[PDB]
Design a binder for this molecule. Structure first.
Ligand SMILES: [Ca+2]
Lengths: 165, 165
């Protein structure tokens, strides 16, 4: 059924832009219960997989996305002690350590304060956070040639990568 | 009358969070004929001036924002060679070079592709772009101790700064 929604909105190139992706995911039902995704979330989604640097996404990259979404949806549900579609600060920190990140308390704090609406973290923000977390790390790893946990960036390169995400 | 909108929505702390800032700017009228700001835009606004790292904004910082908004709105109008309210790729590159940035073609292209809707760039995305452009540069500058156009980042520090923006 997946291809059906993709194709339904895909362009002449068989690729979707952030706006079409949004429609596709929504018409998809993946977030059926929860808060539908925002255009900003969808833009980060594309940037996370835009290796050809076109601002669009093909069905092969979409399949990777889909895999990642259902995985993140799973974690959201398992930290969702209860139900309502919103997680708590603590519930969020636990989800992040669950995806394999080992961030410090201050950084985690920053991240949470970034996506909080009344001590709550809605589904959309939770997924935006997951996608951005990955995109940034991939960008950083590519600059950390010896994998030392540090990297040197030249201004223009630094900007191009972070503005894109 | 600036303070009136600020205080109308301001919290117990006399500070506004992203959500209240949105209400304030909107109720403010600065949006002209253009499109109203989005919550995402407002969050970058606060992050751009959040020196105390609280996720909120006081009236002193708000004054700085206001100054920058009016300035950005001026440029938007001057590149809008046809009162569309939306600018074009070229009109956008022109506004970026106008704010003092000397970015390479590829970088500029990436930036444009990030905020484009059918070859159009709405006011909200245009302001989101200007805010983010400055926030990232400020972060970079702070790590470029000798101002050489390059800087070394430790992963956790890198994430904290970019996730906040
Ligand atoms: Ca125009």
């Amino acid at each position: 059924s997946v291809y059906t929604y993709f194709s339904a909105v895909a362009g002449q190139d068989g690729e979707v832009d952030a706006e079409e992706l949004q429609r596709c995911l929504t018409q998809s039902g993946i977030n059926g219960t929860y808060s539908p995704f925002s255009l900003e979330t969808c833009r980060i989604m594309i940037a996370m997989l835009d290796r050809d640097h076109t601002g669009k996404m093909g069905f092969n990259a979409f399949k990777e996305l889909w895999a990642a979404l259902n995985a993140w949806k799973e974690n959201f549900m398992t930290v969702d002690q209860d139900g309502s579609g919103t997680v708590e600060h603590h519930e969020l920190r636990q989800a992040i350590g669950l995806m394999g990140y080992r961030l410090s308390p201050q950084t985690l704090t920053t991240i949470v304060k970034r996506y909080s609406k009344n001590g709550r973290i809605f589904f959309d923000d939770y997924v935006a956070c997951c996608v951005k977390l990955r995109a940034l790390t991939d960008f950083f790893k590519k600059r950390d040639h010896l994998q030392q946990g540090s990297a040197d960036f030249i201004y223009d390169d630094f900007l191009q990568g972070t503005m894109a995400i």
